[PDB]
Amino acid sequence: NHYGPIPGIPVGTMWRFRVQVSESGVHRPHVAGIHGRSNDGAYSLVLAGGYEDDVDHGNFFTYTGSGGRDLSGNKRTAEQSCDQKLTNTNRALALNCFAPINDQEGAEAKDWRSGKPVRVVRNVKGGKNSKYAPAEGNRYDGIYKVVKYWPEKGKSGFLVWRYLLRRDDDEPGPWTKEGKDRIKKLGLTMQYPEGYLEALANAH
DNA sequence: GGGCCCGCAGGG
DNA sequence: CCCTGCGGGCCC
């Protein structure tokens, strides 16, 4: 539903599980990387190193579309086994870009800052191929905007949709000096589900 | 009512 | 250690 930050949830907020990010409003889907409607646009997305074509550079990153995958056998993830399409959440994210939607060669917003805002969450699994992933769980990293998107062959050899997102947010990134100071001042700390830690105090 | 899914953990 | 496939929410 909502575009932009969630009122009163500062950049640097951390949650241990995806479900907690969801109940916060920050990223509603419990599994999916993109939260979006195909005739409106995308509200939030997660970098979790789930797609090999994701490259994260912090203040900007190239995100991969979802799909191009065989999820037979009641799967949630798989390797690329066919071309992605500009449909569903992929189409949603493309609409955020401040340029006419083109599903053949993609598009670029000259005035990208005028595009729709995307809430961006970074998850620890993104750490294999990124300097910007938190050490644990999920972290709210602020607002980014889609500069451009285009199709190309991924590492797998199949077509993927690729999106350049660039940061556009007055709250500083949590990996920066000021981001770290703010987090410290606010006392931001990993949020666990209720009862979770107690259940872990059950090592015997 | 069916599709989708950047998680997660039980059980091998 | 590695593997399998479940709920449930949200979309359409």
From Swiss-Prot:
Induction: Up-regulated in proliferating cells, and down-regulated in quiescent cells. Down-regulated upon adriamycin-induced DNA damage, in a p53/TP53 and CDKN1A-dependent way. Induced by E2F1 transcription factor. The record marks R76 as: Required for affinity and specificity for 5-mCpG sequence. The record marks T64 as: Required to confer preferential recognition of cytosine over thymine. Ubiquitinated; which leads to proteasomal degradation. Autoubiquitinated; interaction with USP7 leads to deubiquitination and prevents degradation. Polyubiquitination may be stimulated by DNA damage. There is a cross-link at K131 (Glycyl lysine isopeptide (Lys-Gly) (interchain with G-Cter in SUMO2)). Signal peptide: none annotated. This is E3 ubiquitin-protein ligase UHRF1. It comes from Homo sapiens. The lineage of its organism: Eukaryota, Metazoa, Chordata, Craniata, Vertebrata.
